[PDB]
Design an enzyme around this catalytic site. Structure first.
Site, short mmCIF file in Angstrom:
data_model
loop_
_atom_site.label_atom_id
_atom_site.label_comp_id
_atom_site.label_asym_id
_atom_site.label_seq_id
_atom_site.Cartn_x
_atom_site.Cartn_y
_atom_site.Cartn_z
N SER A 1 -2.32 5.39 1.28
CA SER A 1 -1.36 5.21 1.00
C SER A 1 -2.28 4.16 -0.57
O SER A 1 -3.44 4.69 -1.30
CB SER A 1 -1.93 3.78 1.74
OG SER A 1 -3.38 3.01 1.54
N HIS B 1 -1.43 -3.53 2.76
CA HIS B 1 -2.22 -2.75 4.35
C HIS B 1 -3.61 -2.84 3.86
O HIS B 1 -4.49 -1.71 4.69
CB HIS B 1 -1.50 -1.54 4.21
CG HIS B 1 -0.14 -2.17 4.75
ND1 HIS B 1 0.97 -0.38 5.20
CD2 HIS B 1 0.23 -2.68 5.07
CE1 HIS B 1 1.91 -1.15 5.51
NE2 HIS B 1 1.88 -1.72 5.73
N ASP C 1 4.93 -4.90 -0.48
CA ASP C 1 3.92 -4.66 0.51
C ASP C 1 2.67 -4.29 -0.61
O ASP C 1 1.96 -3.54 0.01
CB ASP C 1 3.81 -3.35 1.47
CG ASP C 1 5.22 -3.48 2.62
OD1 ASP C 1 5.00 -4.74 2.91
OD2 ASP C 1 5.53 -2.50 2.81
#
Lengths: 171, 180, 177, 171, 180, 180
Positions: free
Chosen positions: C128, C54, C76
């Site tokens: 994140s 991301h 991810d």
């Protein structure tokens, strides 16, 4: 290092007031050459120097050719857009802020003393003592006793219009 | 050859009648310069807010190499000359307004006031030798430059070159003004 | 030092529990800024470096910005290694998860429900890629995302199982940080 | 008055001139692989060393491979040119300066002890007590208790070398 | 108007930091004279051991009727002019040697030293307006005259016109010297 | 910068040997002016009772715009020039008589007396550089103007231009007078 008890006030109302404002020079030589200052929603990078901005979200903007203005205008992200330089349109005759000196307003021409700004410094905004930019300097011009700055200001109808005293210096 | 830090030989005694140096202190501090024809002063010349107003009627040289070796054409419709001022005498010299209120303006040879339209000084001002004088405020702001004008009984009425309320450079002149 | 510059030092010296941010002194992740704005961090672990998918930028460290990573799609993230100064990775390995409190950058998470968990909105956009740390300095969990849980807030993390095998631990309806 | 020393030996103890005439490191991804500076107005950077100069104005200099010198020479701009130090033609037999210790001229060979140097920063010039550049050091093998180095001594006539004794490894 | 026998208004206080007036006291006592183009100083000119070294690059007049009304041809291979010095500025003006040791020579804007071949002063010397300066000893003996030379980091390296060890008049010049 | 009303820095001490300032005080107070050829004084020039007596032998300019830019023809029969004096140096400058008694007249470089016909000063007067000097009374009244005349043993005999007893402008001249 003199620590007496005089009147403070930043002497004269530019020393933090310009310095808190987000005008960001980066030269190819890693220094000042001409200042990109965020103004309202847009930043005014100098057209006639070479270099970038002291911000990753501002230097990576693509900026449009204001050869009309001898600058370049472009996007300012929201992470700078609140703390841009709030402007004013009017210009009464009076002492305004300059980080090397002061202009006194006279005949649509903003005048630092001789050797104060103009060359290698311009795009430094001209701030009201109330704290608003009137105009963005392009460079020059030596007016002997003083030095009139070639500026880009708003008019009485609020139109961003380049001013150029004749024979002005390129930044 | 001694060491004081001395103030003011001449005119800073403690007794002061007044502080009406607005006709003398600012006017000498102005960038006005004589047109001396063979040394004989026949009129001062000064840079006003930009262009210089050299007396076209007056011949001789000026105390400025940026002004005396400098060719100026003829405003013979007003008997004036223009500028052509180099940058070294630009950015603050003899700011002004175009209008005049019925108030106290000045030069070298005294102050001027008039009720309605014109300019008059007291008698004895001299129009010969001096004319070419800017007409400054107590602020220090020009409204005209002397063309002369005859002594008239009590007061010398003046001719000048001046500006319109619309800013248009005009001349106020009584019948039979004085030469320069 | 004329106003307080911490040289007057302090009256309450270490007479109690040490800190919870001494292991954030060992935070050798890096503020991955896509144009000045931190989207995430780059996590070293065992020398093998990664960062969440991301997140773009990337890295203020010239070293870690010079290593091409390999995309782990269902984790991810994109992984690689740190060359030739590798023990800058203080972010070592935990797997053992007693249900306690493990150090995270905005305060220690709560572990329960097979989930690391902060209070309401303690995360932020940019959180994140943050490591979640033991009181031994060991790093258990790498924040991909998370989701609010009313009184507290979940953390979608890259952590390991009881075998120590990687897992994209993800609450339902989790969002990036 | 800033010294604060009880009784030091009156010697230029490898920081008054040597750290003052600092030779700029060559880092490649943090890891410093060499030193490099300018002597005599011409850039030296070791050919056996890759990476980047501290100075942007020196790392932007395209350099010429002196392959029989293990230096990549070019030209400094004005920006340092006066600071590009010094030499006079002698090699006095005795102890010299070094950015970790001292090196001895002995039998046309530079004798630094063991351990000192020989690490991975190989571009420091040996300096004089006069501050003059003696020898940019490029290699060297630990000759047991002491160490001889691959240097540039220029010569007795001021004519450059790659003064490598046997077995010397580029550090 | 009084009668002391007074010494020294300006610079003979009892506290002295040093006596390094060899770059100022002798240099003003030299027969150096400005080439003022319309009053603007663009370079000094001086008689050196015989012939005068007028800056050929610099225009304007000199503070000497024995030098300013005096036509001098072109050493354009060095950008110099020669003399032609009248006898009234002969027999002691700016003696010299041809060589230079690596030592302290001077002028108006400071002192010069360089290790090997050349001349360098610290940064901020100015090459514009001043150049045409003789390079005197603490004894007071010329070795060169300034051609300029750019500021180079810490020190301004100099270009000069100078003399060979064989006495041959030569110029030392770095790449891109400063004008005058 | 202080406030006394001070008299006389130089020459008004209480001890006075004499008051023989008739050769110095009046002569400087005269309207005499040097003919300086390129600054070099080669003879003074003065207005005498009307017309000016410019040295025709002497070239150079004069310290007067009313005299130096002023073309004068040749009294080469006497080596003089006439006037042509403007009114600003008229009505009292160097009155005179035509005759001379055997008495004390003067100028800059001392006093003159002679027994019969002529003029002689003591030796060491100088004829070069100074000549063009009016010959004033203790009253201050001219009788001649110096042409020179050689040193003659004890006394320098003079040549002059002077006037007849009939008032006719004549020259007294010994054999081999001095130039100017």
């Amino acid at each position: 290092k003199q620590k007496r008890k005089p009147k403070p006030g930043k002497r004269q109302r530019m020393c933090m007031k310009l310095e808190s404002d987000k005008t960001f020079p980066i030269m190819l030589n890693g220094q000042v050459n001409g200042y990109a200052c965020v103004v309202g929603g847009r930043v005014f990078k100098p057209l006639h120097v070479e270099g970038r901005i002291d911000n990753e979200q501002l230097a990576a903007i693509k900026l449009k050719k204001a050869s009309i203005y001898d600058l370049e205008y472009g996007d300012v992200p929201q992470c700078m857009k609140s703390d841009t330089l709030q402007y004013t349109s009017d210009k009464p005759p009076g002492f305004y802020n300059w980080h090397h000196g002061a202009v006194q307003y006279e005949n649509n021409r903003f005048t630092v003393p001789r050797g104060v700004g103009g060359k290698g410094d311009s795009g430094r905004p001209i701030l009201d003592n109330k704290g608003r930019v009137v105009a963005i300097v392009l460079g020059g011009v030596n007016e002997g006793s003083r030095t009139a700055l070639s500026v880009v200001t708003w008019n009485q109808k609020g139109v961003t219009v380049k001013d150029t005293p004749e024979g002005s210096e390129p930044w």
